[PDB]
UniProtKB/Swiss-Prot annotation:
The record marks 14 as: Involved in dimerization, receptor binding and signaling. Changing residue 31 to L: Loss of activity. Changing residue 28 to Q: 40% reduction in activity. GO terms for biological process: angiogenesis; animal organ morphogenesis; antimicrobial humoral immune response mediated by antimicrobial peptide; astrocyte cell migration; cell adhesion; cell surface receptor signaling pathway; cell surface receptor signaling pathway via JAK-STAT; cellular homeostasis. The record marks 25, 50 as: Involved in GAG binding and receptor binding. The gene is CCL2. The chain holds residues 24 to 93 of 99 of the full protein. It comes from Homo sapiens (Human). This is C-C motif chemokine 2. Disulfide bonds join 12-37, 13-53. Belongs to the intercrine beta (chemokine CC) family. The record marks 19-20, 59, 67 as: Involved in GAG binding.
Length: 71
């Protein structure tokens, strides 16, 4: 499949944020799935360039995808 992602760094989330984030401040996102991680997650990159770990299961989270996907 991959060429040789074995040397690629692996990024995982260990806890999730508890405060919802404004759509006006989210710049991007990415899904965390590597089986090397304790669990699935979403990493939101903010307008002030901060990266936050969020629960895939939360509505605010999912709706934030919708808006970034241009809804």
């Amino acid at each position: 499949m991959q060429p040789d992602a074995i040397n690629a760094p692996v990024t995982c989330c260990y806890n999730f944020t508890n405060r919802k984030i404004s759509v006006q401040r989210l710049a991007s996102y990415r899904r965390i799935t590597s089986s090397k991680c304790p669990k699935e997650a979403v990493i939101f990159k903010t307008i002030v360039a901060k990266e936050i770990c969020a629960d895939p299961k939360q509505k605010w989270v999912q709706d934030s995808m919708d808006h970034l996907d241009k809804q």
